[PDB]
Amino acid sequence: ESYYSIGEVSKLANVSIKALRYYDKIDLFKPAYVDPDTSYRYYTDSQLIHLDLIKSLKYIGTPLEEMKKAQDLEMEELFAFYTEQERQIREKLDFLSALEQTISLVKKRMKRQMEYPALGEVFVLDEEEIRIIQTEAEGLGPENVLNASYSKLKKFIESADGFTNNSYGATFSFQPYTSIDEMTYRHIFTPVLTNKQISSITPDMEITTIPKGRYACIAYNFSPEHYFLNLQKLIKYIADRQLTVVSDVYELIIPIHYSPKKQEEYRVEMKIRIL
Amino acid sequence: ESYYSIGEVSKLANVSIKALRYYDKIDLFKPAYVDPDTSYRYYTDSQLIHLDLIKSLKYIGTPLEEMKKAQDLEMEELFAFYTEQERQIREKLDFLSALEQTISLVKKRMKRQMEYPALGEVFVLDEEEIRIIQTEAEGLGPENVLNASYSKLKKFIESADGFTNNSYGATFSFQPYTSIDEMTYRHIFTPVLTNKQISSITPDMEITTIPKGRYACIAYNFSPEHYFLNLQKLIKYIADRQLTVVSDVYELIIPIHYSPKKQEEYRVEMKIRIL
DNA sequence: GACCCTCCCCTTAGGGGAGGGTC
DNA sequence: GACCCTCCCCTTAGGGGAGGGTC
Ligand SMILES: NC[C@H]1O[C@H](O[C@H]2[C@H](O)[C@@H](O[C@H]3O[C@H](CO)[C@@H](O)[C@H](N)[C@H]3O)[C@H](N)C[C@@H]2N)[C@H](O)[C@@H](O)[C@@H]1O
Numbered sequence: 338e339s340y341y342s343i344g345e346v347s348k349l350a351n352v353s354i355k356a357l358r359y360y361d362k363i364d365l366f367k368p369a370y371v372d373p374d375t376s377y378r379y380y381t382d383s384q385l386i387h388l389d390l391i392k393s394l395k396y397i398g399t400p401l402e403e404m405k406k407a408q409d410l411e412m413e414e415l416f417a418f419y420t421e422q423e424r425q426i427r428e429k430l431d432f433l434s435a436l437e438q439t440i441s442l443v444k445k446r447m448k449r450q451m452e453y454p455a456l457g458e459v460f461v462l463d464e465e466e467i468r469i470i471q472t473e474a475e476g477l478g479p480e481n482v483l484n485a486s487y488s489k490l491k492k493f494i495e496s497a498d499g500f501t502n503n504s505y506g507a508t509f510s511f512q513p514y515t516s517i518d519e520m521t522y523r524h525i526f527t528p529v530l531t532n533k534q535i536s537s538i539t540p541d542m543e544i545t546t547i548p549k550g551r552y553a554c555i556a557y558n559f560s561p562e563h564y565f566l567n568l569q570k571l572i573k574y575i576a577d578r579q580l581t582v583v584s585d586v587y588e589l590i591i592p593i594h595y596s597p598k599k600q601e602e603y604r605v606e607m608k609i610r611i612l
Numbered sequence: 613e614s615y616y617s618i619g620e621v622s623k624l625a626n627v628s629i630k631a632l633r634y635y636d637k638i639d640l641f642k643p644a645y646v647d648p649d650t651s652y653r654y655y656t657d658s659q660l661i662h663l664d665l666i667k668s669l670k671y672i673g674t675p676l677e678e679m680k681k682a683q684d685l686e687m688e689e690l691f692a693f694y695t696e697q698e699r700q701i702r703e704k705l706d707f708l709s710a711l712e713q714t715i716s717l718v719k720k721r722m723k724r725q726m727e728y729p730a731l732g733e734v735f736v737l738d739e740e741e742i743r744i745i746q747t748e749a750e751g752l753g754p755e756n757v758l759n760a761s762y763s764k765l766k767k768f769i770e771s772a773d774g775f776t777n778n779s780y781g782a783t784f785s786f787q788p789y790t791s792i793d794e795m796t797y798r799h800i801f802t803p804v805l806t807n808k809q810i811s812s813i814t815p816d817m818e819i820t821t822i823p824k825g826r827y828a829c830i831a832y833n834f835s836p837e838h839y840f841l842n843l844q845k846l847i848k849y850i851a852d853r854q855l856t857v858v859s860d861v862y863e864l865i866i867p868i869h870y871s872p873k874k875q876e877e878y879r880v881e882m883k884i885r886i887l
Numbered sequence: 888g889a890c891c892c893t894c895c896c897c898t899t900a901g902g903g904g905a906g907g908g909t910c
Numbered sequence: 911g912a913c914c915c916t917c918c919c920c921t922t923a924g925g926g927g928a929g930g931g932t933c
Pocket residue numbers: 479480482483484505506507517559561564590603605
């Protein structure tokens with residue numbers, strides 16, 4: 338015998354007016370009475386029960402046209418719909434959960450770049466392993482290597498990590514080169530950062546890693562004059578301190594920013610392993 | 613010296629054409645060259661680097677106008693933005709994680725209702741505790757009690773669980789009543805299903821629970837003729853098997869469906885505790 | 888005054904599709 | 911032929927606000 342205006346319901350049910358009006362329009366929840374002249378909406382007390390579900394499902398995030406299907410459902414049938422919701426949640430849980438490790442690790446790798454002891458000078462250091470995806474570089478050089486050169490590797494990684502490599506890598510044979518002009522990349526690769534499977538990897542992609550070990554490194558900010566010089570510096574450090582190299586030179590390039598409105602700049606790192 | 617059409621980039625970067633066009637419109641990522649007559653878009657190989665971030669941030673779910681702010685940021689500053697993302701993730705993780713327990717528990721309570729040994733007959737059984745929110749019922753009766761009668765309790769629960777009670781409860785003193793006409797509810801309550809804090813609960817709300825114990829129950833599907841009868845049945849079962857009651861009668865009403873296009877139906881349960 | 892009505896413009900990140908024109 | 915262009919209509923769950931009228 339008590340009837341509620343939209344305002345009354347709104348306050349009562351902690352749902353907004355514009356919201357009830359909306360739910361009225363999509364015929365998910367309609368007033369018991371619409372005065373035909375004033376088009377005012379009036380609601381019975383016994384209606385409010387229909388909101389409990391709506392409100393819940395909303396909180397869960399069920400889309401509206403979907404609630405409508407849910408309303409009809411009988412107790413046993415609704416139960417199942419819930420466990421559907423349960424499974425859908427576990428997914429998001431996984432998906433984020435994964436992302437959390439990913440980002441913490443992206444961050445961990447960004448740290449070293451800012452904590453690098455000095456630029457332009459060579460030093461040795463003890464390195465954790467880095468897993469990576471590589472492919473034969475088909476006669477590519479520092480000179481003519483392209484971004485596009487990476488696109489297949491980059492599919493795989495994205496399909497795997499979801500989270501595109503900040504980084505670009507290539508390797509080549511440690512030699513007394515005298516010229517950029519003399520150098521060819523053996524493979525080019527990009528680091529993976531998930532231990533998530535890589536479905537349907539084709540066999541022209543080797544999964545391998547930059548082994549744990551001790552490394553003569555040198556790292557600077559790119560510019561053409563320095564590239565070759567710093568390589569030189571490296572070779573020298575080896576030959577002088579008289580060491581035995583046991584890998585290629587690994588070279589990794591990392592943007593310092595992605596502003597398309599500032600001049601491009603990149604951090605380069607050449608490392609190599611020793612006995 | 614190699615330039616890419618939108619199609620070329622799209623395939624290269626595994627981003628859609630309509631997507632690059634869009635990113636062009638919002639000046640997040642613009643081609644290096646737009647032919648002035650054909651309005652064809654052309655891109656440099658050295659541009660594709662700007663997509664790695666975009667693509668990542670997208671995967672993380674960063675909104676676009678926000679990526680723009682991120683692009684300018686310097687390595688140290690970007691690092692922080694990430695940990696912002698890290699914290700924002702942990703929230704969702706919590707939020708869902710909570711929901712998962714909630715739903716598993718909503719489900720657990722829905723089960724018993726469908727696994728209830730028989731309807732209309734009384735039996736005793738051993739009950740887990742049920743926490744709940746209640747309030748003095750201010751002389752309310754089975755006769756005149758309303759949905760609205762619950763609205764404050766229901767705020768609290770929603771503010772706490774997010775997930776509106778499927779259920780509605782009231783209690784009253786076990787007596788040889790002869791009439792619905794004789795009955796008053798002592799409190800009316802609604803079960804909580806989170807152990808999450810209930811911020812700024814006002815003191816006219818008692819947090820308490822339906823204690824763990826042994827209970828004479830009876831549960832049926834509502835209709836006016838049966839209500840009082842089944843109560844009667846209950847009283848009788850006690851008096852005959854000669855038992856001592858140690859609580860009020862708890863009464864709980866639960867919709868069987870929320871279809872607003874079928875006749876309303878409800879499951880009632882009256883239980884009481886014994887020594 | 889305080890509610891309530893309808894109606895209209897607004898948001899995100901594009902996809903689908905038309906009706907051209909181009910490489 | 912296969913690319914690419916612009917332009918337009920579409921989606922979700924409403925909120926904000928106008929310009930009335932009503933309880
Ligand atoms: N590793 C080659 C890389 O190409 C791009 O850019 C990096 C290159 O190394 C530079 O290219 C060359 O610059 C000069 C003339 O081109 C040469 O003297 C020099 N030896 C080369 O390094 C480029 N311009 C900037 C940045 N350093 C990408 O970031 C990455 O796809 C890829 O890994």
